[PDB]
Amino acid sequence: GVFNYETETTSVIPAARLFKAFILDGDNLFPKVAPQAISSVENIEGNGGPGTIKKISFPEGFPFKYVKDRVDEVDHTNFKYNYSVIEGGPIGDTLEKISNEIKIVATPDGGSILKISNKYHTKGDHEVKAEQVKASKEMGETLLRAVESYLLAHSDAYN
């Protein structure tokens, strides 16, 4: 079955720039700005569009060793990015996939709002716990804040 979770968060960075950095250049930025959260990102197959597979490794001591994520869609006009967790970590006999959608929207103050949906696809019917969703949110927020801090400090990056 599918369990749907939605959240929203804000950024002080304008949408297009935040999209170029946090979404389009995450493979590079995440291990650089948040090494305590992401040890490395490996491109396994594909050139960045639908179907591209990445292996994201976590630091020692984390609950999981890695996940493989697959790019589902990338909308460079409307700042939408869809990707799925397809192997590793929580994926296995109870959880087939996590499908995610991120949309970044401009706000008139010059920042942005990120709208995030996480859909957990379980085998038949087993149950997703608030704890697993929380952990995802916390990771996403750590990464956002680390990227935001970098973009604040490096004005010539991603313009």
User: Annotated binding site: which residue ranges?
Assistant: 54, 81, 83, 100
Among 18, 104, 140, 147, binds ligand H35 (CB under 6 A): 140
HEC profile of 100-128: EEEEEEECCCCCEEEEEEEEEEECCCCCC
Taking CB under 6 A as the rule, does residue 141 contact ligand H35?
yes
CA distance 141 to 29: 15
Q: Which helix (H) or strand (E) holds 133?
A: helix 130-153
User: Minimum distance between the CB of residue 69 and ligand H35, rounded to whole angstroms?
Assistant: 7
Determine, following the binding rule CB under 6 A, whether residue 89 of this chain makes contact with ligand H35.
no
19-78 residues near ligand H35, rule: CB under 6 A = 23, 26
Name the residue type at position 133. V
Min CB(24)–ligand H35 separation in Å: 10
Which H helix or E strand runs over 23? none
Give the interface size with ligand H35 as a residue count (CB under 6 A): 14
Pick the closer one to ligand H35 by CB: 63 or 124: 63
At 126, list the tokens. 């087993």
Instruction: Work out whether 116 is an interface residue with ligand H35 (CB under 6 A).
Output: yes
Q: Which is nearer to ligand H35, 95 or 116 (CB)?
A: 116
Classify residue 57 by burial, with Cβ atoms within 10 Å: 0-12, 13-18, 19+: middle
Q: Which is nearer to ligand H35, 9 or 132 (CB)?
A: 9
115 vs 122, which CB is nearer to ligand H35?
115
Distance (Å, whole) CA 23 – CA 10: 15
Are 9 and 114 contacting, i.e. CB atoms less than 8 angstroms apart?
yes
Place of tokens 């008139």: 108
Residues at the interface with ligand H35 (CB under 6 A) = 9, 23, 26, 100, 102, 114, 116, 118, 136-137, 140-141, 143-144
